[PDB]
Amino acid sequence: MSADFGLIGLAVMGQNLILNAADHGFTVCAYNRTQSKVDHFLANEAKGKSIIGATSIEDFISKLKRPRKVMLLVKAGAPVDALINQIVPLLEKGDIIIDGGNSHFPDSNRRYEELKKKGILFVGSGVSGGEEGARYGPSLMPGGSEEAWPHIKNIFQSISAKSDGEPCCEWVGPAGAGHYVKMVHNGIEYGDMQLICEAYDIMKRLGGFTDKEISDVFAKWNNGVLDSFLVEITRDILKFDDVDGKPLVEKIMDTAGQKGTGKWTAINALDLGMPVTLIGEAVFARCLSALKNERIRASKVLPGPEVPKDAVKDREQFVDDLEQALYASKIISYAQGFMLIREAAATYGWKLNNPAIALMWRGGCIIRSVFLGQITKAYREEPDLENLLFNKFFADAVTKAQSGWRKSIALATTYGIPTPAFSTALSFYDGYRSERLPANLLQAQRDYFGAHTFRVLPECASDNLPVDKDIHINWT
Amino acid sequence: MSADFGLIGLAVMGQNLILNAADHGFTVCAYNRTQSKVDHFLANEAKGKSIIGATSIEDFISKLKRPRKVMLLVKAGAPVDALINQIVPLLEKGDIIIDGGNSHFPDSNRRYEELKKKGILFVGSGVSGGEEGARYGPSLMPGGSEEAWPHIKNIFQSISAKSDGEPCCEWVGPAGAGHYVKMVHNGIEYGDMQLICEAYDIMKRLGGFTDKEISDVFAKWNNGVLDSFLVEITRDILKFDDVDGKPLVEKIMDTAGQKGTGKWTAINALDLGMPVTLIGEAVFARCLSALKNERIRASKVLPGPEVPKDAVKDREQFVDDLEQALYASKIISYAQGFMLIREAAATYGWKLNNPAIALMWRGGCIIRSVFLGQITKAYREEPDLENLLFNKFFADAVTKAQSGWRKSIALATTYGIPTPAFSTALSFYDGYRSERLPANLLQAQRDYFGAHTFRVLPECASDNLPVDKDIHINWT
């Protein structure tokens, strides 16, 4: 029948995607596990647009052009498998299932291979932008069956956010790759929110700035190198007054939530053996924050330095150093993010495209920023770039940051303001640039209590201690 | 027939356990997947001791007193399930399978429940001490079927290391709990090795100490508050000369290995939502070290501060500050370790005993130290202690450490020596003691781009913004 695609799952997110598609001249068939929301949606915001409803699953399936394109925006987990299982029999080879939910990539790897067995095409797609991003242009990160891409390309790229004419949507890669890349985006997200919160914390508890003053600093920083959506909303949150003129944010319970996609990145980093330390710290910091009552109790007993009113003499220098600390740390976190992507490409055998991934994150998504355009640029120039930090633009940024980065950390250190993300970024940076790390002692220790053996430095190879061989020493 | 227990798996580890049991007056039946190693072992080190061999699996099973006690010391994974599956039919209800290998606890949870279904008793046991620890007194951490404990108690406690008359072996708890606790011990281990390596690195690259000088510092520190096995072997490694008089350790390739048990703790911390940041950093640092060629390349291009010959004027003060940094950081890592244990007890419904776990880690194991005795003591006094840092002894240690801890970190920061573990410990400490963290902004941010909602501080509850309710604000 008539409908370019259908979408099941009519939460605000999916409704806005359908609306977005309709506005771009697609006929969309809207459906849900239930009914109330279909009729209601057709009655209100879908009215007078190219949006048709459905009553049955077979009705839905019947209203869709060939090959049938079935997008799901449902809760992750078994409900995704529920729909898939009741849709497969109503389908024929070459039809396309699109999971747009925040599904864990091994599930998408599985659904991909299972559907493939039946000749059904699978697209596991990341979607980012929130409610309003879905309405006007989300970031879309499709992966799965490559042969499904020519069929969803025009729908996806038309509705996606644009960055300098270019759509924020390219084919990510095979199997669970789209959801994988969406996962990492969410890990990076956690990192950027933690880094921003540390800047706020240092200005508040160390500098003694009012929220309006910290808001103005974010206003100022957004006008420069840190230009980004998260810095904008932070600027906006910090000046937001409660009904009583007092800053609303200072009344919020300081216990961070996490639905899960953030820990997944840290876990994956661990599985893959990549040092994604900042995202790790960002996840652990939310875990720390959850422990509200334990911290109230801790605050009454554990000592720390006094923060005098005059700890910051030069407020301009303080703020300028902090900007470089935030900015350099962010560069570390993203450099770590792309190391992860680099290792996952290699381990999973996925041909992940670094410029395209950065492009897809430039707009639509929560982490959108000018900074990301600069990442796209670096990888356009060298798509084989082994680390972001080997790019001149980022190497220069990090060189310029040196003094402000270290000064802000020593300052937070001296005055007892927690900087988990700033600290781990500098430690990683200083470790990463070390030709020789103290892991030589680590190896010696291991060979000592466990005879686990060790390799010799090629420049130290000798009679005993030969190159490319596992050496054990009797240390006793 | 005759044999208190049998042990399958005749690697050096298991051989030494059998030997240890024999010396304590047990008749042990030795067996292997194969034969050569059984005959060979009976021919040499088991000769003239109460150790008998076996030829068949049924032969092995027949030589064992009732209820039959079958210990496995084989490679983790499927080989453990292999043995179990071929032993179960040759067994009868109430017989006891003991897995002493380094098995991942969910596997032990599974084997426990499966064997339980057949009325077979299961013990998943941690074993720590290495080759020589197995020969004279390892740490043993049994968990599984409580009803198996009265049957293995005397064998286990007799052969285990002693700390002040007390055996380093108590019943850990149900299902996979023994292996769980062994896992965490190994996470803690990673942390202590990384912390030690950072002290070494700072003295070497920042202080410009020779290895003999750093060895003497560890000699000195081992005579005090840091008294421990790992500090001893480090002291010993650092003075160890290669065949050419040059320090051997400086020739070792600085790429750390990890068999896996270390990442498991960080992953579990993530699954459980506990801020086990130091173990995380220790695992990530090994991951960083593996990247040898990328770091050589990084070292040639990325800038950092110069370390002048006179960066350390006062070597005595430098060393004294560092000792407090190492010591305070270690206290953080262990405090994090027991938070993990605390959450796992609660989430899994396991009645984990904190004094007993600390006791079991006091001796035999790689992390053995006087420090651990002090942990046992703290939990004997208050077994309900919510955090180690609420204990006076540790609170005082951390109070005394303040100045040396922060000074060493600011120093490594200023001069560009990586201190991932020192840094994360201080950040965690400063976060943990904060009544209010900037997770209030995090929550505001989330409620803004995703309407995820937030709670109000009870002391800020009002007309709008009521207590114990999920608030959303229209920030725009």
Numbering used by the authors:
A (entry chain A), B (entry chain A): 1 to 476
Tell me, in the authors' exact words, what the paper reports.
Moreover, we determined the crystal structure of Gnd1 in complex with two citrate molecules by molecular replacement and refined it to 2.37 Å resolution. Similar to the 6PGDHs reported in other species, Gnd1 forms dimer. The dimer is formed by the C-terminal tail of two subunits threading through each other forming a mobile lid on the substrate binding pocket. To our surprise, two citrate molecules were bound to the active site of each Gnd1 monomer. The negative charges between two citrate molecules lead to electrostatic repulsion, so they occupy a larger space than 6PG. Previous study has shown that citrate serves as an inhibitor of 6PGDH. Our current research provides for the first time the conformation of 6PGDH bound with an inhibitor. From the structure of Gnd1 we found two highly conserved residues, Arg446 and His452, to be vitally important for citrate binding. These two residues were also shown to be critical for 6PG binding from structural studies of sheep liver 6PGDH. We further studied the role of the Gnd1 C-terminal tail and found that it is dispensable for dimerization, but crucial for the enzymatic activity.
The 6-phosphogluconate dehydrogenase (6PGDH, EC 1.1.1.44) is the third enzyme of the oxidative branch of the pentose phosphate pathway. The 6PGDH catalyzes the oxidative decarboxylation of 6-phosphogluconate (6PG) to ribulose 5-phosphate (Ru5P) and CO2 with the concomitant reduction of NADP+ to NADPH. Prokaryotic and eukaryotic 6PGDHs are generally homodimers, with a monomer of ~470 amino acids and a molecular weight of ~52 kDa. Each subunit is comprised of an N-terminal Rossmann fold coenzyme-binding domain, a large all-helical domain and a small C-terminal tail.
